[PDB]
Amino acid sequence: GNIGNLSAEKQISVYDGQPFVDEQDVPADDPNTPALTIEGPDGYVIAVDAGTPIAPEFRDSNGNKLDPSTRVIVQKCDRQGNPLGDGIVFNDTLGRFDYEQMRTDPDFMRKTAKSLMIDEREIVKVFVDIPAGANGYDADKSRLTLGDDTSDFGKAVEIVDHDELSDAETRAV
Amino acid sequence: GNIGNLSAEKQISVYDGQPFVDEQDVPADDPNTPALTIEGPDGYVIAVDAGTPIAPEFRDSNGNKLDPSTRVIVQKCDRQGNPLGDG
Amino acid sequence: GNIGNLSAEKQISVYDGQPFVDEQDVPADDPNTPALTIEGPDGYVIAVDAGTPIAPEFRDSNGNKLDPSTRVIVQKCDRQGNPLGDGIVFNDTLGRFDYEQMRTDPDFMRKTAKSLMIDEREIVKVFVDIPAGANGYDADKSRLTLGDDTSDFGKAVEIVDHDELSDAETRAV
Amino acid sequence: SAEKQISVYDGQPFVDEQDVPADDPNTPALTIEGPDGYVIAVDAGTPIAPEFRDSNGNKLDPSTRVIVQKCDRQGNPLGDGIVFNDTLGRFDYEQMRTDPDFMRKTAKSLMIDEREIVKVFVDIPAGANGYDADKSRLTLGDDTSDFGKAVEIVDHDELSDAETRAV
Amino acid sequence: YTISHTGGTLGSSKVTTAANQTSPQRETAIIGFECPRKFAEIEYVGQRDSTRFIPRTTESITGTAGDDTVVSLTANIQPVAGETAIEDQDYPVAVAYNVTQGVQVDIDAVDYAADEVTLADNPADGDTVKVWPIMGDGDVQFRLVNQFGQEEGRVYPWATPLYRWHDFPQLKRGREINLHGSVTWEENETVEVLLDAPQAITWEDSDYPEGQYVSTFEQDVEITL
Amino acid sequence: YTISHTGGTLGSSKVTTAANQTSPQRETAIIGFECPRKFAEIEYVGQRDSTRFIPRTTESITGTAGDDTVVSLTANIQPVAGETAIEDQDYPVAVAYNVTQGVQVDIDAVDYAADEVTLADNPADGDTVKVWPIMGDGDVQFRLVNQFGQEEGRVYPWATPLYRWHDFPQLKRGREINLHGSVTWEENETVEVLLDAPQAITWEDSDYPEGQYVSTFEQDVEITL
Amino acid sequence: YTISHTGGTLGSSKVTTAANQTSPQRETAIIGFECPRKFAEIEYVGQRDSTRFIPRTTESITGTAGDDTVVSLTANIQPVAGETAIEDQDYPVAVAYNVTQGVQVDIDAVDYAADEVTLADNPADGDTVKVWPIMGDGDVQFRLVNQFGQEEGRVYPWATPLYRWHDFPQLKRGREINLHGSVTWEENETVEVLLDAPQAITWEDSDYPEGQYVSTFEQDVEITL
Amino acid sequence: YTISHTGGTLGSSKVTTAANQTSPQRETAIIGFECPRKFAEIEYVGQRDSTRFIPRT
């Protein structure tokens, strides 16, 4: 009655429900406020290699999709909450997306551009640039699905504990 | 599910209702009108040899047999419609 | 004022309205009645390569679709119309198709198995096997689209006139 | 060539249907017997369209279990040699034979000779309403898509069948 | 090892199909000789293998006074391969049965050309009487179908006029019919005899007097074990 | 040295002619693409250059009680890309306009076999309605005309039926039409879209609701400078 | 020497367990796949062998005048496959049964964000209806237990959010729900599926119309003999 | 192996076509000379073989 051992590389996805990320409601027209906020898991490393999908199911309080004019941005920050300018992976609109099938069919899938990597306290943030006419943001009725851990399409996200030379080279930012 | 291949020379018969042969009712005493016409089937070739039989059951509208004194003639023609005399 | 000279191999598709093809309304339960009847066009030669699609948009007099368990059959015959038995290209059903899109996406483009080659008088026939309960065949409302001559997808059919040794080797079936 | 690429369905005189009670799986639902002169070959990766319904035309319970299973010439199952085992509910009767993305294929190849038998076993719950293969049917394989796969049929050729009788 | 043996209306197997044709001139399947699991293969050979065929149709009339005579029957009648008066023939050109009295009736006279006849007695005014005469025009041939129900070949693709099967006595060597073409069967396959004709044909009329079967098809073949 | 342009309903020049066909079923000149002074020469390439054709015709009716339905319009209507229900289609199979109210109509439903439609607003008795549906049957091709007005030769002497342009979702890449043949213009020369169809087709009806042009013939081309 | 089977709700034995959880949020055993003596050993492979899970729970309501709508169901609903309207789905998000009339009910429409629904048939006052909607939130995983009844451990301790099984079109290849890790069984050993979430999943409602099991677990697996 | 003939208003067969044009200034087909099955081919050589036309309205 054995399971079979594992690599340290756990191939998963990322979503609001996990206990190391925070959501937050958003007013009308501030890009600067962080809607999402990952934090480092305090001991493990996350790795999002290139070509990684997103599925940002953002809606209003009334269940409707936001205006496609809004632009979504993902961005790395330091261990204090401050971005770097570089390290950005994604800047686009919701008009690109098909909520009906954005996480389904690879033809419609929207992947990152750059690789990305996370130490025990590193942070990624989501920024949402909106006009005034929007109906804000309701995080309870909205969510995200980052990556795929199920399909023969898309890719996953690697997570690992600290191993010696792996972390020796991984801390080389 | 076999059938057996065939020699090219198919031994058959001929009758009125075939799609390379035409009928035409004739008036009383017109010989030059062709009652029956046969034409080549556009791709195959026919060969009749002598001693070939006939059942030429020619009747009227009421079906009663004709005047037995009637004459019949069968003749090859040109590609236009003109009989040859020869042949 | 130039037009551009042409090869003999005209790449086309085939349908009912063309003047070398005939339709016929059909009852339910004869798999032998020729619904469609192609003939040689009296001088040209047709070649359907193996790997050719079909769209047999078959319906009833009330416009509805036939029973999907219906079987469509396509078969070559002689100059007198007697099928040769062999030289079959098709044996499948209607339920396999989807009339909404059966001539659009290659994922649904049902195609032939073998090649085909028509002399100046050879004939192709199309047959239909159904149970009794159906609402028959209404060719006046139904149609067929054989091959494509418009898309980057699919293939077409080659019409040609008589080139000498081409025909000499072609007649050697 | 001698190899013929076709499909298979119920309305053929090498195949038998048998309407079924509620929840008696051990009964043969369907049966395929050899044709006594030809030889059949299936490769793995081959679709199924088990259009099973009730007397009243409605679909069965999704939680049904289906098996295709080889048997000996006697008719007894070998246990091994299964090609497929899944639920009806996995399929979509509206399009289960149409889109390859919805097609569901075998997990093994298969070979049938002049006496071998394939059986179809069907384990249904208690409450449902039998199975009438009059209004239901089946179609196995396709020879039309570049996708999918056909089934090979042959007359007896010497060397291949000589290999084949080493089972 | 083989034998020479005949298939027929019933013959070896009570699965052969016998159906009726159409009035629109579309060549249809008269009979289907399906092969069983009992045997291995069958073989039919034109120019060697004898055949026998008595086709017959069914018409009807109503009775009125003086109507001892029946009109043209939509059928070009022939004598029975040499003879005109029925009593000396291999078989009757036609037979008549009154339904009300429910009996066979004797035929008196014929006009084959006009396709008319005259009976032994006058029917009752208002009665009904049916007639079973032979078939006239039509062209006939042979076809094969696999076990899959799809076509596999017409045999010698040139049909024959139906009338000769009347116009020769079939029970006499030389006079018997030897067609052209050959064909071989398999287990679940089926050969089909086909016809195109103006008129309808019949089998199994309850009121026919001479047997349960108004017409007959028979063919001698070879059989493999 | 060339680039890619498109010829259009207007195209690169306000001399392109738009005329309609006859009711006597005989082929006519639909459109004349006349090459202008501005350019050097024009090239068409079948199997490279896409083409789009939204034809649309005209019918008219008068209102009275119970006229929520419009007839079989003498046109073999077809679904659009296979799709039927209006709001989901690539473009409307048909539109209609009440003249007296002077407004657009929205449509409930369609029956394609009987070629009928079902509206929402029962028009008034004595009122007038126009309808603009697609065109159904029709065989088109391209013709060449010199500066003199003489026919040189047709392109790829094999017509194109109309209804494929409706059957395919014209905007999807690869699915879009690519006819056959080639042709090249000169300065004062003309090319002509010809059609044969039984129903009259239109352009530029004032009472259209969606746009000042009801029907479009767009084509991709290569151009020299 | 191995083959591919499916373990499921019932599968290869009547010893597999199915029970429900508690409302106090702390996970419990939903299903137990016990291995039989019939086989030798069973294998799981994440990322290879497909898996399927249709969860469905129970709600109850009493009717009165104007009770066409059903309120926030304590249940986070998602449009299946992205699709909102019912009959376009791969399966119904929700089902309704009147017990007083003892019959199925058709649903009119949905609001997903408010988590409310609108039926077609107004119920009666004093009448009782039950509803079978999907399960929404919750966290799942597998677990292992020896022959004794002791935890051996989990597999890949990253509980998949339950609504993913509702998101994708499970019946389509390439999108099917696979997981990460592997595990091998032995004779008297039992794998379990465990869950935690607020609402109480249900099987085996006799009054349910569309099947003798409302909610299903299925999983392709590998077997030795 | 060839000889000469005349095609005409009636000519070698009654499969020709004889129709009239339209008043709108657009050309039509006045006459149609269709070949029969009788002859393998017909040939007209301008500058060699004459043509005659007596039109009348």
Author numbering:
A (entry chain e), C (entry chain k): 2 to 174
B (entry chain i): 2 to 88
D (entry chain g): 8 to 174
E (entry chain I), F (entry chain K), G (entry chain L): 8 to 232
H (entry chain J): 8 to 64
From the primary publication:
SH1 is an icosahedral double-stranded DNA virus with an internal membrane. It infects the halophilic archaeon Haloarcula hispanica. At low resolution, the ~100 nm diameter T = 28 icosahedral virions comprise hexameric capsomers, each decorated with either 2 or 3 turrets (type II and III hexamers respectively), enclosing an underlying lipid vesicle and within that the genome. The two MCPs VP4 and VP7 form the crenellated capsomers, some of which (type II) have two and others (type III) three turrets that form the external crenellations.
To understand how such complex systems self-assemble, we have determined the structure of SH1 to 3.8 Å resolution. The penton protein VP9 (149 residues) surrounds the 5-fold axes and comprises a classic viral β-jellyroll, strikingly similar to the penton protein P31 of PRD1 (75% of the Cα atoms of P31 can be superimposed on VP9 with RMSD 3.6 Å). The major difference between P31 and VP9 is that the first 56 residues of VP9 extend inwards, in a largely helical arrangement to form tight interactions with VP12, which continues inwards to form a bundle of five transmembrane helices around the 5-fold axis. The MCPs VP4 (232 residues) and VP7 (185 residues) are arranged as hetero-hexamers (capsomers), underneath which lie, unexpectedly, less well-ordered proteins. VP7 and VP4 comprise upright viral jellyroll structures with VP4 topped by a further small (~75 residue) β-barrel inserted in the DE loop (the loop between the D and E strands of the canonical viral jellyroll), as seen in VP17 of P23-77. The smallest building block is a VP7−VP4 heterodimer formed within the hetero-hexamer. A six-residue N-terminal extension of VP7 is strapped onto the β-barrel of its clockwise neighbour to stabilise the dimer, if and only if, that subunit is VP4. Key to this level of assembly are protrusions of VP4 from the perimeter of the hetero-hexamers. These are formed of extended EF loops (that lie between the E and F strands of the canonical viral jellyroll), which bear a hydrophobic tip comprising Phe 155. Secondary structure predictions, knowledge of the minor capsid protein composition, their relative mass and the protein size inferred from the density strongly suggest that this protein is VP13, and an atomic model has been constructed.
